[PDB]
Structures are given as C-alpha cells and as structure tokens.
Ligand binder design. Structure first.
Ligand SMILES: [Zn+2]
Ligand SMILES: [Zn+2]
Ligand SMILES: [Zn+2]
Ligand SMILES: [Zn+2]
Lengths: 78, 80
DNA sequence: GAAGGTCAAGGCCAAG
DNA sequence: CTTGGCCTTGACCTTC
C-alpha cells in the first residue's frame, strides 16, 4: 500500500508524522530518546535505502528529520 | 463528579463493565474476556496495580478487574 | 452512558 | 552491541 519516505522499504503506516518502516521508526525513536549524535564518515550525503540504511546513522537521522519526522511525537521513557 | 479507575487509580472516563475504570483497564478487560486469554504471574499473585505499573503483570491486572467487580457478561461479541 | 472499533504509540526480544 | 518484527496498549472516536 505504502513505502517508507526515508528508505523505500514497505511502510506499515505513519510514525512521527511520516509514512515509515518499522526500522526507521525504531531508529528515530532510539535517537530522540537516548539523545544520540552521530558522525558521518563520508560527505553527509549517503544513500539511505533498504540495503544501505544501516551504513550511516548520521545520514539516516538526517533523512528522518528532512522527510518530516517529529522529535516531539517521541514520548518519554517508562 | 470526577472519578478514578477502581483498578489502577488513573482518571475514570466513566463506568465500564459495571466498574469505574480508565480507558486502559476498560481496553484490557475487553481483549482478555474476548480472546479468552489466560495469564500467569511471575511473582506470588500480589503485584501492585497502579497508573505506572499495570502492564508489568497481566495476571494481576486481570485479577483486580474481577475482584473490583468488572463483568465478563458485559463484554459483548465482535461487531461483524 | 456505555457498549463497540481504530491505529499510532508503547514494550519485548530474537535477529542481525 | 543495535536493528527491526510482532504484538499489546489506550487516547480518541463511533455505534447503540
Ligand atoms: Zn525505512
Ligand atoms: Zn553519511
Ligand atoms: Zn485503570
Ligand atoms: Zn502478578
């Protein structure tokens, strides 16, 4: 029915405002929650697709935000 | 007046299966009675069931639903 | 009011 | 270790 706006994999439905896969939803939650920061080993323009999404966390978070993922929709830890 | 859930002390959205409960305890009881679910306590069936510790034990949450007066008979069948 | 249903948010844990 | 699949929960809603 839908595709992930960040990597192109199958989308379950919307998560944090964006149509995304379980992977991308999980990764964005974890980053906002633990307040993580990553470093790009390349030139901050890595290909984020199903096969390459775990090659660069920096650019994956960067795509999450750019595609409209909302940090505020990530509720606090139990 | 304002009411609190008889099972966990969360805000009560009204009476549900005869008992003043919240949307959480209401939901939980429905899915338990409907799917005829059976749980098992990892401790000795005395777990505290409050607003922030209710999903830690499904066995005890269900037990307090019954002990407090929720009616299995009030849980209807799936709208086909 | 009090039944019903929905679906994005949660959590867990096996896969990777 | 982190990733992500799968299932539970409950805020918000409609149906009776
Ligand atoms: Zn994705
Ligand atoms: Zn990169
Ligand atoms: Zn409750
Ligand atoms: Zn218990």
């Amino acid at each position: 029915k839908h595709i992930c706006a960040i990597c192109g994999d199958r989308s379950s439905g919307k998560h944090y405002g964006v149509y995304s896969c379980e992977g991308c939803k999980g990764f964005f939650k974890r980053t906002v929650r633990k307040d993580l920061t990553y470093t790009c080993r390349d030139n901050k323009d890595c290909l984020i697709d199903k096969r390459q999404r775990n090659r660069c966390q920096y650019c994956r978070y960067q795509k999450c935000l750019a595609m409209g993922m909302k940090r505020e929709a990530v509720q606090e830890e139990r």
